[PDB]
Amino acid sequence: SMKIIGAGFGRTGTLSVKAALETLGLGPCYHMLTTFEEPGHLRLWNAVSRGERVDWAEIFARYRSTVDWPACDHWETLAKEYPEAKVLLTVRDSERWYDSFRQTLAPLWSAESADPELAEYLDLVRHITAHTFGGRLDDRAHAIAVFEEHNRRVRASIPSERLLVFDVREGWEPLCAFFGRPVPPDTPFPHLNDRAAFQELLS
Numbered sequence: 001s002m003k004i005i006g007a008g009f010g011r012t013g014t015l016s017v018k019a020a021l022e023t024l025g026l027g028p029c030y031h032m033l034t035t036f037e038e039p040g041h042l043r044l045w046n047a048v049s050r051g052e053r054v055d056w057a058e059i060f061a062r063y064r065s066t067v068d069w070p071a072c073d074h075w076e077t078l079a080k081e082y083p084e085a086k087v088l089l090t091v092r093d094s095e096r097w098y099d100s101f102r103q104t105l106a107p108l109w110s111a112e113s114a115d116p117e118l119a120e121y122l123d124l125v126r127h128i129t130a131h132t133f134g135g136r137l138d139d140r141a142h143a144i145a146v147f148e149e150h151n152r153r154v155r156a157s158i159p160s161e162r163l164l165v166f167d168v169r170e171g172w173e174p175l176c177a178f179f180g181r182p183v184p185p186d187t188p189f190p191h192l193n194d195r196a197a198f199q200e201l202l203s
Protein backbone atom coordinates (compact mmCIF):
# COMPACT_ATOMS: atom_id res chain seq x y z
CA SER A 1 0.00 0.00 0.00
CA MET A 2 1.01 3.62 -0.60
CA LYS A 3 2.21 5.44 2.56
CA ILE A 4 2.20 9.08 1.29
CA ILE A 5 0.11 10.84 -1.35
CA GLY A 6 1.90 13.99 -2.53
CA ALA A 7 -0.66 16.67 -3.32
CA GLY A 8 1.60 19.59 -4.24
CA PHE A 9 2.07 20.87 -7.77
CA GLY A 10 5.30 20.46 -9.59
CA ARG A 11 7.90 23.16 -9.00
CA THR A 12 7.54 22.92 -5.20
CA GLY A 13 10.95 21.24 -4.69
CA THR A 14 9.56 17.80 -5.50
CA LEU A 15 12.82 16.09 -6.59
CA SER A 16 14.40 17.16 -3.30
CA VAL A 17 11.35 15.93 -1.37
CA LYS A 18 11.52 12.65 -3.28
CA ALA A 19 15.12 12.21 -2.15
CA ALA A 20 14.29 13.21 1.43
CA LEU A 21 11.41 10.71 1.66
CA GLU A 22 13.64 7.93 0.28
CA THR A 23 16.35 8.79 2.85
CA LEU A 24 13.74 8.47 5.61
CA GLY A 25 12.79 4.99 4.37
CA LEU A 26 9.45 6.09 2.95
CA GLY A 27 10.09 5.17 -0.69
CA PRO A 28 10.34 4.22 -3.42
CA CYS A 29 8.86 7.60 -4.28
CA TYR A 30 7.15 8.25 -7.60
CA HIS A 31 7.80 11.58 -9.36
CA MET A 32 6.94 13.11 -12.72
CA LEU A 33 10.21 11.80 -14.12
CA THR A 34 9.34 8.23 -13.07
CA THR A 35 6.73 8.15 -15.83
CA PHE A 36 9.57 8.10 -18.40
CA GLU A 37 11.33 5.23 -16.63
CA GLU A 38 8.26 2.99 -16.23
CA PRO A 39 7.13 1.41 -19.51
CA GLY A 40 3.47 2.02 -20.21
CA HIS A 41 2.88 4.44 -17.34
CA LEU A 42 2.18 7.50 -19.50
CA ARG A 43 -0.51 5.46 -21.31
CA LEU A 44 -2.08 4.66 -17.94
CA TRP A 45 -1.96 8.27 -16.72
CA ASN A 46 -3.65 9.44 -19.92
CA ALA A 47 -6.38 6.87 -19.34
CA VAL A 48 -6.82 8.20 -15.78
CA SER A 49 -6.98 11.74 -17.17
CA ARG A 50 -9.73 10.70 -19.61
CA GLY A 51 -11.83 9.48 -16.69
CA GLU A 52 -11.35 5.77 -17.33
CA ARG A 53 -11.17 3.20 -14.56
CA VAL A 54 -7.58 2.10 -13.96
CA ASP A 55 -6.36 -0.18 -11.19
CA TRP A 56 -4.09 2.08 -9.16
CA ALA A 57 -1.81 -0.85 -8.36
CA GLU A 58 -0.84 -1.00 -12.05
CA ILE A 59 0.94 2.32 -11.36
CA PHE A 60 1.86 2.24 -7.70
CA ALA A 61 2.42 -1.40 -6.66
CA ARG A 62 6.23 -0.94 -6.44
CA TYR A 63 6.00 2.52 -4.81
CA ARG A 64 5.21 3.76 -1.31
CA SER A 65 5.04 7.52 -1.92
CA THR A 66 4.40 10.00 -4.73
CA VAL A 67 5.15 13.70 -5.34
CA ASP A 68 4.56 16.14 -8.23
CA TRP A 69 2.43 15.64 -11.27
CA PRO A 70 0.72 13.55 -12.46
CA ALA A 71 -0.53 12.22 -9.14
CA CYS A 72 -1.05 15.53 -7.36
CA ASP A 73 -4.13 16.29 -9.44
CA HIS A 74 -5.69 13.04 -8.17
CA TRP A 75 -5.03 13.58 -4.45
CA GLU A 76 -8.71 13.27 -3.50
CA THR A 77 -9.32 9.91 -5.13
CA LEU A 78 -5.90 8.60 -4.05
CA ALA A 79 -6.54 9.59 -0.44
CA LYS A 80 -9.75 7.52 -0.59
CA GLU A 81 -8.01 4.61 -2.37
CA TYR A 82 -5.26 4.47 0.27
CA PRO A 83 -7.08 5.50 3.46
CA GLU A 84 -4.07 4.86 5.70
CA ALA A 85 -1.72 7.00 3.62
CA LYS A 86 -0.79 10.46 4.84
CA VAL A 87 -1.08 13.45 2.50
CA LEU A 88 1.94 15.70 1.88
CA LEU A 89 1.13 19.11 0.38
CA THR A 90 4.38 20.59 -0.93
CA VAL A 91 4.12 24.39 -1.21
CA ARG A 92 6.24 27.43 -2.07
CA ASP A 93 6.08 31.23 -2.30
CA SER A 94 3.66 31.85 -5.18
CA GLU A 95 5.89 34.24 -7.15
CA ARG A 96 8.83 31.84 -6.98
CA TRP A 97 6.57 28.90 -7.86
CA TYR A 98 5.39 30.66 -11.01
CA ASP A 99 8.94 31.83 -11.87
CA SER A 100 10.05 28.19 -11.75
CA PHE A 101 7.00 26.95 -13.63
CA ARG A 102 7.46 29.47 -16.48
CA GLN A 103 11.22 28.88 -16.62
CA THR A 104 10.97 25.09 -16.55
CA LEU A 105 7.62 23.68 -17.73
CA ALA A 106 5.50 26.26 -19.56
CA PRO A 107 7.56 26.20 -22.82
CA LEU A 108 7.63 22.39 -22.91
CA TRP A 109 3.95 22.01 -22.03
CA SER A 110 3.12 24.49 -24.83
CA ALA A 111 5.25 22.76 -27.46
CA GLU A 112 4.53 20.49 -30.40
CA SER A 113 6.89 17.62 -31.15
CA ALA A 114 7.09 15.36 -34.15
CA ASP A 115 8.86 12.94 -31.78
CA PRO A 116 6.38 10.08 -31.20
CA GLU A 117 8.23 9.46 -27.92
CA LEU A 118 7.13 12.76 -26.33
CA ALA A 119 3.61 12.44 -27.68
CA GLU A 120 2.15 10.67 -24.65
CA TYR A 121 3.74 13.12 -22.22
CA LEU A 122 2.45 16.01 -24.32
CA ASP A 123 -1.04 14.48 -24.29
CA LEU A 124 -0.86 14.32 -20.49
CA VAL A 125 0.36 17.88 -19.92
CA ARG A 126 -2.17 19.18 -22.45
CA HIS A 127 -4.84 17.58 -20.31
CA ILE A 128 -3.44 19.18 -17.16
CA THR A 129 -3.32 22.51 -18.96
CA ALA A 130 -6.97 22.26 -19.98
CA HIS A 131 -8.39 20.70 -16.81
CA THR A 132 -6.32 22.44 -14.09
CA PHE A 133 -5.10 25.69 -15.70
CA GLY A 134 -8.17 26.51 -17.80
CA GLY A 135 -6.12 26.46 -20.99
CA ARG A 136 -3.60 29.19 -20.10
CA LEU A 137 -0.05 28.77 -18.81
CA ASP A 138 1.49 32.14 -19.77
CA ASP A 139 -0.62 34.28 -17.38
CA ARG A 140 1.05 34.76 -13.97
CA ALA A 141 -2.07 36.11 -12.21
CA HIS A 142 -4.21 33.19 -13.33
CA ALA A 143 -1.58 30.52 -12.73
CA ILE A 144 -0.86 31.79 -9.22
CA ALA A 145 -4.62 31.85 -8.55
CA VAL A 146 -4.84 28.19 -9.67
CA PHE A 147 -1.89 27.21 -7.45
CA GLU A 148 -3.26 29.00 -4.40
CA GLU A 149 -6.76 27.60 -4.87
CA HIS A 150 -5.40 24.07 -5.28
CA ASN A 151 -3.51 24.40 -2.00
CA ARG A 152 -6.64 25.74 -0.26
CA ARG A 153 -8.69 22.82 -1.56
CA VAL A 154 -6.26 20.24 -0.16
CA ARG A 155 -6.10 21.98 3.21
CA ALA A 156 -9.89 22.19 3.40
CA SER A 157 -10.47 18.51 2.53
CA ILE A 158 -7.82 16.47 4.34
CA PRO A 159 -8.08 16.52 8.16
CA SER A 160 -5.18 18.31 9.75
CA GLU A 161 -3.88 15.18 11.57
CA ARG A 162 -3.48 13.44 8.19
CA LEU A 163 -1.97 16.36 6.24
CA LEU A 164 1.53 17.83 6.35
CA VAL A 165 1.96 21.17 4.55
CA PHE A 166 5.67 21.48 3.75
CA ASP A 167 8.06 23.88 2.02
CA VAL A 168 11.61 22.68 1.44
CA ARG A 169 12.91 25.86 3.13
CA GLU A 170 11.81 24.25 6.39
CA GLY A 171 14.36 21.43 6.10
CA TRP A 172 14.20 18.05 7.76
CA GLU A 173 12.65 18.84 11.13
CA PRO A 174 8.97 18.83 10.00
CA LEU A 175 9.22 15.68 7.89
CA CYS A 176 11.05 13.85 10.57
CA ALA A 177 8.54 14.92 13.23
CA PHE A 178 5.43 14.14 11.14
CA PHE A 179 6.67 10.71 10.01
CA GLY A 180 8.67 9.93 13.15
CA ARG A 181 11.73 8.95 11.13
CA PRO A 182 15.25 10.06 12.02
CA VAL A 183 17.96 11.53 9.86
CA PRO A 184 21.58 11.59 11.08
CA PRO A 185 22.69 14.72 12.93
CA ASP A 186 24.08 17.46 10.68
CA THR A 187 22.53 16.07 7.49
CA PRO A 188 21.93 18.83 4.94
CA PHE A 189 18.50 18.93 3.36
CA PRO A 190 18.76 17.89 -0.33
CA HIS A 191 18.60 20.69 -2.92
CA LEU A 192 18.37 18.88 -6.22
CA ASN A 193 17.64 20.33 -9.67
CA ASP A 194 15.54 18.53 -12.34
CA ARG A 195 15.27 21.53 -14.71
CA ALA A 196 17.55 20.00 -17.35
CA ALA A 197 15.43 16.86 -17.72
CA PHE A 198 12.51 19.00 -18.83
CA GLN A 199 14.43 21.66 -20.75
CA GLU A 200 16.26 19.00 -22.77
CA LEU A 201 13.15 16.98 -23.70
CA LEU A 202 12.39 18.86 -26.93
CA SER A 203 15.91 18.99 -28.35
Ligand SMILES: [Mg+2]
Pocket residue numbers: 018019020022023
Ligand atom coordinates in the same frame (compact mmCIF):
# COMPACT_ATOMS: atom_id res chain seq x y z
MG1 LIG B 1 17.50 9.74 -1.20
